[PDB]
Amino acid sequence: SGAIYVGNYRVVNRHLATHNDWANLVWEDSSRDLLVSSTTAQGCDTIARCDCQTGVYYCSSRRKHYPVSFSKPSLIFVEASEYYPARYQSHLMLAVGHSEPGDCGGILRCQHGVVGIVSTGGNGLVGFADVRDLLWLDEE
Ligand SMILES: [Zn+2]
């Protein structure tokens, strides 16, 4: 689990979004495994605006932060999970690293702030849904 809180926005894995997330839907993209919902409280997270390919992610299944190199946001074929059928996910970034189902929502960050959240895993690879292209997250 895990979320990004920036301004009046909550960013979560679409597949972990709650009733309240869907009741306050701002934007969702099934191909990206992202959902954004509105918040009453002002969020403090800074979204990275950059093309960094290195950063640190939180891995709940190891209670550890790992430094990783990751690929640029891409259309990548992702195997069946249970939450999704074996399909293409867009704006996905892979790194060599540990990822289990409950690691989703783990934040990936560089020096410029939040890059994305854990979205996929398996075969010793971790996939991160990019948020750095969502410029609208940093106004109203
Ligand atoms: Zn960066």
Distance, CA of 62 to CA of 67 (rounded, Å): 13
Q: Are 5 and 45 in contact (CB under 8 A)?
A: yes
Distance 53 CA to ligand 1 centre (A): 8
Between CA 54 and CA 69 the distance in angstroms is 4
The single residue of 21, 33, 103, 130 carrying the catalytic annotation is: 33
d(CA 74, CA 61): 25
**Active-site annotation holder among 59, 103, 104, 130:** 104
CA 23 to ligand 1 centroid distance, Å: 32
Round to whole Å and give the CA distance between 64 and 35: 25
Task: State which approach was used to obtain the coordinates.
Answer: X-ray
Resolution in A for the shown PDB structure? Answer: 1.7
The Cα-based distances of 108 to 1, 119, 129 in angstroms read: 13, 11, 9
Q: Give the residue among 52, 126, 135 at the shortest CA–CA distance from 96.
A: 126
